[PDB]
């Protein structure tokens, strides 16, 4: 039961998410191999994802994490890029669909840099690029990133 | 690594962040976009 609320470009909530997307673009060591060559985005659509069931599921977990982390959730707004964005907005994030051989194990990965999450939109290392043109640096095909509430709680530092 | 280490709720890779339970993230905003061709 997911509702998408289309935000107007003149809405401050749209502009806030727009600016976080544009301002967190970085130069990448792969020189654009994974996510393409760009300094900015064409922001076409920002929709608020409204799902009561998935939100209560989130806030319930957040409370449990707070009580185990000195009454603080350590909540962060972070980007997620994935070929499975359509499934995530309808059924929620699902650890059961995580690849076991990730750098930090079978987990769901987030970035504070939009350009980092952009590298995973078409798969690991940008996969084979956009479906139509097989181009990781495609300027034509429309991409989708999630800007997510993430409860980190007590976060284990790893190199 | 299958779950968070004991007493922990996430991993900070160094910066990327990893959770091991789907219910610890909510996909609040769906952003449709293109990467811009540099002029
Ligand atoms: C097939 O997929 C799904 C289908 C339905 C619900 C959820 C999902 N999938 C995920 O929530 C999901 C997110 C991220 C990763 N991987 C990394 C690298 O972060 C894997 C699975
Ligand atoms: O959003 C992401 N999706 C998939 N893999 C990642 C790896 C590192 C940082 C972010 C991501
Ligand atoms: Zn394309």
Author numbering:
A (entry chain AAA): 952 to 1110
B (entry chain A): 1115 to 1128, 1137 to 1161
The authors write:
The crystal was subsequently placed in a solution containing 3h. Although all hydrogen bonds were conserved and recapitulated the overall binding mode in 3k compared with 1, the phenyl-containing linking region of 3k showed poor electron density, possibly because of the flexibility of this linking region. Similarly, the conformation and position of this linking region differed when comparing the structures of the fragments with 1. These results indicate that the linker could be under strain in 1 owing to an unfavorable gauche conformation. A different linker could possibly resolve this strain and result in a higher binding affinity. This cocrystal structure prompted us to investigate this region and seek improved linkers to circumvent the unfavorable linker geometry.
TNKSs are ADP-ribosyltransferases that catalyze the transfer of multiple ADP-ribosyl groups from NAD+ to their protein targets. The poly-ADP-ribosyl groups act as signals for subsequent ubiquitination, ultimately leading to the proteasomal degradation of the target proteins. TNKSs are involved in the regulation of many cellular functions such as telomere homeostasis, mitotic spindle formation, Hippo-YAP signaling, and glucose metabolism.
